[PDB]
């Protein structure tokens with residue numbers, strides 16, 4: 001594989017460079033590969049990295065280019081005027097803009113393969129898109145190609161889509177190179193910011209909902225949603241994966257599955273991004289989603305998660321049943337047996353399944369992972385697989401029958417639950433899950449967790465876990481170091497998806513920062529360790545779309561400008577989930593916050609959705625975030641889009 005042309009350190013501010021002499025008559029087949037290492041000096045406007053065109057008047061629509069948008073989209077066009085053929089292939093959120101005050105160096109590539117009739121695009125080690133098109137065009141197919149340009153496209157004798165930046169290195173090949181060669185050629189520093197990668201140990205092509213936490217030992221812990229049937233919240237097959245770093249985030253463990261069902265296996269699916277397929281979903285699969293981490297005072301770690309039985313969306317879960325039944329003062333999980341209409345059974349002591357009608361134990365029992373036994377032996381069901389030719393079918397593998405499955409003999413109430421697991425070794429191993437009792441009441445479903453961390457209120461030792469119902473905040477708490485759980489339900493002014501996080505301002509004084517349906521971040525204050533809550537106030541410097549986004553806010557252990565500090569991450573834009581910012585807030589003696597500093601994470605039109613902050617052992621700050629707009633139907637089912645970055649406080653002061 002030898003380049004037909006190579007150029008280096010080409011600095012441009014809109015005007016481009018003519019390379020026609022060097023490239024006219026190099027592309028005999030018509031196929032091509034172009035690999036471009038670049039950085040942008042200005043991201044505004046549509047910019048072409050190179051352009052091969054018919055430059056004569058009348059032939060404005062006869063060209064091939066690779067382009068970048070101010071939102072980080074990478075794409076290509078291949079067009080021919082006289083035949084009115086117009087190919088466009090792209091993927092949102094493909095490149096980085098700026099990082100810590102400097103333009104980021106990216107490496108992207110295009111492959112045009114006339115035998116396969118495909119265009120492929122690569123960015124920073126990932127094949128971001130591959131598309132077979134019917135009206136395929138290569139360089140020879142376009143009539144009268146006479147101009148070859150770096151950093152623009154010559155249309156009707158004028159430069160269009162002028163690039164602003166430096167082409168550090170650009171290589172043209174007169175053939176289609178193979179996938180692994182180009183992935184490798186595009187690998188760079190950007191590629192190293194992934195902790196979870198598509199089709200890693202987890203078997204998932206997709207991830208959403210990152211969480212970071214630092215343990216007392218100096219381990220930095222991460223969890224994430226491993227979402228297997230694309231990035232849909234529901235319906236989907238979702239596991240919680242984890243990974244950790246014992247060296248201040250420089251290196252991470254291979255990801256482990258920590259909360260998982262096996263009614264479907266953990267295997268990679270190629271989820272359609274086209275408008276006609278992207279609404280496809282994995283239907284019948286039990287799920288964990290939305291993790292919350294806290295470390296207790298005794299150094300045991302807790303992790304909570306939402307639990308969804310197979311076929312239960314957030315929208316279709318019954319809201320008028322907890323899934324639990326009260327018998328002689330105790331709460332017990334109800335079960336319906338196949339062929340019954342009513343819920344005649346309960347799980348009591350030792351997981352023994354009781355017939356409530358007779359008040360006698362049956363021969364069935366439920367294990368600590370919700371698996372169903374009969375006379376002490378496991379019942380089985382066939383595992384499902386997914387295939388695209390979409391079809392879901394039984395694959396011949398037997399797994400334990402489970403109360404959360406579609407094919408179970410005994411089934412839970414089709415509603416959402418909360419489960420928690422604990423670790424005595426800083427997240428190397430975990431207990432079996434405990435389903436949370438019906439803290440909201442017997443005739444109400446469980447709340448939904450606000451992903452991220454919980455806190456320990458220093459003065460009382462109260463454990464606080466943020467959650468919400470749709471209409472209320474539900475602050476789940478324990479006053480006996482996690483042996484028992486209660487909830488403070490707080491009515492909100494409207495139907496907020498009130499994903500929240502807590503900070504402590506001073507002893508006894510806490511604030512819950514949350515998403516709303518009004519465009520603002522709300523904060524509620526408690527001066528009695530969470531027992532009662534003030535009316536909401538709103539941050540005046542963040543302005544988001546009405547749907548909102550999850551946020552992250554943490555306490556920071558070191559003084560900044562002599563003051564106690566908190567650190568907030570959120571998008572900040574009414575155009576979408578964009579324009580990520582980190583804000584440093586300094587607490588005053590009266591417990592108001594001086595929001596003194598902010599730092600923009602990349603350019604304002606680049607994507608920034610859910611995020612998580614942690615303080616590193618060395619007092620740097622770790623950030624992981626969805627670097628795309630996770631609301632947009634245009635940015636679903638994207639691979640390798642949740643990076644991790646470390647900041648110094650001095651970095652966060654700038655902007």
Ligand SMILES: CC(=O)N[C@H]1[C@H]([C@H](O)[C@H](O)CO)O[C@@](O)(C(=O)O)C[C@@H]1O
Nearest residue numbers: 046060061067075076077086088160161
């Ligand atoms: C990559 C891309 O989007 N290209 C499109 C451009 C841009 O929208 C520019 O803003 C306007 O030149 O608009 C066209 O009408 C054009 O100029 O022929 C169609 C073309 O497909």
